[PDB]
Design a protein around this ligand. Structure first.
Ligand SMILES: C[S@@+](CC[C@H](N)C(=O)[O-])C[C@H]1O[C@@H](n2cnc3c(N)ncnc32)[C@H](O)[C@@H]1O
Ligand SMILES: Cn1c(=O)c2c(ncn2CCCl)n(C)c1=O
Ligand SMILES: [Zn+2]
Ligand SMILES: [Zn+2]
Lengths: 300, 115
């Protein structure tokens, strides 16, 4: 297959339509690693391939675009994914990032704390999350839908994602949530995308493309995660860094997508059609204001 | 009249054999860019590497105030181009060198305004 020259592999539609039972994830290529270009970190490569794949979808790209990035800090105190996102996004794009622990970032603003403390007045055109707790990789206990930060993310999407906006949310075999899959059915299209540099891992990004604010299809999230694992379990993906070497078409094209403030009574089938085609964003174009809650204690 | 002199400390630390600050965030790019020093997007030419700006700022990385009286950072949210021969120490490079105000290249690493 020519998949080695792509940024990664998306879950084929026929796997989405199955009714599998959840099994253990057993990757044939588990523990192998891709050969990264000299001096390039895994997370720079991973986010680069994610953005290369998002370049093939019908993302809305307005003027004064607003992007928020959760789980943006690394063990090293820096924010490699944020740097890639800022490179990818048009210049001037408002980029906010967040993480539980302190880190140094190129974002326009950074919020430190649990994601549940993050509040924004405004809606967003793109939500990226790399939140992950490695304490979920427990192979000895049953693999249930997880809450924690996924509960926050589902609420954040429904309350603060502009109609027409898109999301990419990191999941793994054990780090997933049934309601988040259900919410993919509220976009005009969705997939699970595996980066070719990290194909030895059960990680994927769950991508909802163009938010419709209502269910377009009814997805059982427990069955769909089982369908995802079944796909991974039966389709080895060859580790590949190939796409990293061609950056000439990398920048997200500034489409100047229209932004409109509309009330619920005004979203008709024609509006929904434009939303579905990546041609319309619905939200206010006010000033972007964020905050994080701070718990106050006096330990004396 | 006291203030911590972080730029001096890092210079002396390097001079006595200390290992340069690591984990500066190197970008993928075409390496066909303009070669200018600090840019809104990666601009490495064939002789350069591009890095996330904040990860190459001594003051950002050390969690200390910037010497700008407004505390503003030249690098944060931008990309810095580092000569490949100096990419083992981007923080040391950006600290020690100065950008030409006319052409935007590093003095002595791209700026030809003195010919
Ligand atoms: C895989 S690392 C992300 C690394 C980073 N995105 C990069 O580019 O290198 C996962 C991150 O998710 C964060 N995280 C886990 N649970 C969180 C929560 N409840 N709220 C905020 N961040 C959380 C962790 O602090 C951790 O830094
Ligand atoms: C923890 N863990 C594994 O141990 C594993 C695996 N694929 C094969 N193996 C070996 C045991 Cl079946 N994945 C995806 C995984 O996450
Ligand atoms: Zn700085
Ligand atoms: Zn000059």
């Amino acid at each position: 297959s020519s998949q080695a020259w792509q940024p990664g592999v998306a879950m084929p539609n026929l796997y989405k339509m199955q009714r599998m039972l959840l099994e253990k994830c057993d990757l044939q290529n588990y523990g192998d690693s891709a050969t990264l270009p000299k001096g390039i970190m895994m997370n720079v490569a991973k986010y680069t391939q994610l953005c290369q794949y998002l370049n093939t979808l019908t993302l809305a790209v307005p003027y004064n675009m607003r992007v928020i990035h959760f789980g943006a800090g690394s063990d090293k105190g820096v924010a490699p994914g944020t740097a890639v996102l800022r490179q990818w996004l048009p210049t001037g794009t408002l980029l906010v990032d967040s993480d539980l622990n302190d880190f140094v970032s190129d974002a326009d603003s950074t919020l430190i704390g649990d994601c549940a403390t993050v509040h924004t007045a405004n809606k967003w055109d793109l939500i990226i999350s790399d939140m992950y707790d490695p304490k979920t990789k427990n192979v000895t206990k049953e693999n249930d839908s997880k809450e924690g930060f996924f509960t926050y993310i589902c609420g954040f999407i429904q309350q603060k994602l502009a109609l027409g906006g898109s999301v990419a949310i990191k999941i793994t075999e054990h780090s997933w949530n049934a309601d988040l899959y259900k919410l993919m059915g509220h976009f005009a299209w969705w997939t699970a995308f595996v980066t070719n540099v990290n194909a030895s891992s059960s990680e994927a990004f769950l991508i909802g493309c163009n938010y419709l604010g209502k269910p377009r299809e009814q997805i059982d999230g427990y069955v769909m995660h089982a369908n995802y694992i079944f796909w991974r379990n039966t389709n080895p993906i060859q580790l590949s860094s190939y796409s990293l070497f061609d950056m000439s078409k990398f920048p997200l094209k500034l489409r100047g997508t229209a932004v409109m403030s509309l009330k619920e009574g005004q979203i008709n089938d024609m509006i929904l059609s434009l939303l579905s085609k990546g041609r319309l964003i619905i939200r206010e174009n006010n000033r972007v204001v964020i905050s994080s809650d701070v718990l106050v204690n006096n330990e004396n | 009249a006291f203030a911590v002199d972080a730029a001096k400390a890092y210079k002396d630390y390097l001079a006595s054999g200390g290992q340069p600050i690591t984990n500066c965030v190197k970008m993928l790019c075409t390496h066909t860019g303009t070669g200018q020093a600090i840019t809104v997007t990666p601009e490495a030419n064939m002789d350069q590497e591009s890095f996330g700006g904040a990860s190459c700022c001594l003051y950002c990385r050390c969690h200390i105030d910037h010497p700008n009286p407004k505390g503003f950072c030249d690098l944060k949210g931008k990309y810095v181009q580092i000569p490949t021969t100096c990419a083992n120490d981007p923080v040391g490079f950006t600290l020690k060198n100065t950008v030409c105000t006319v052409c935007g290249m590093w003095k002595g690493y791209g700026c030809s305004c003195d010919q």
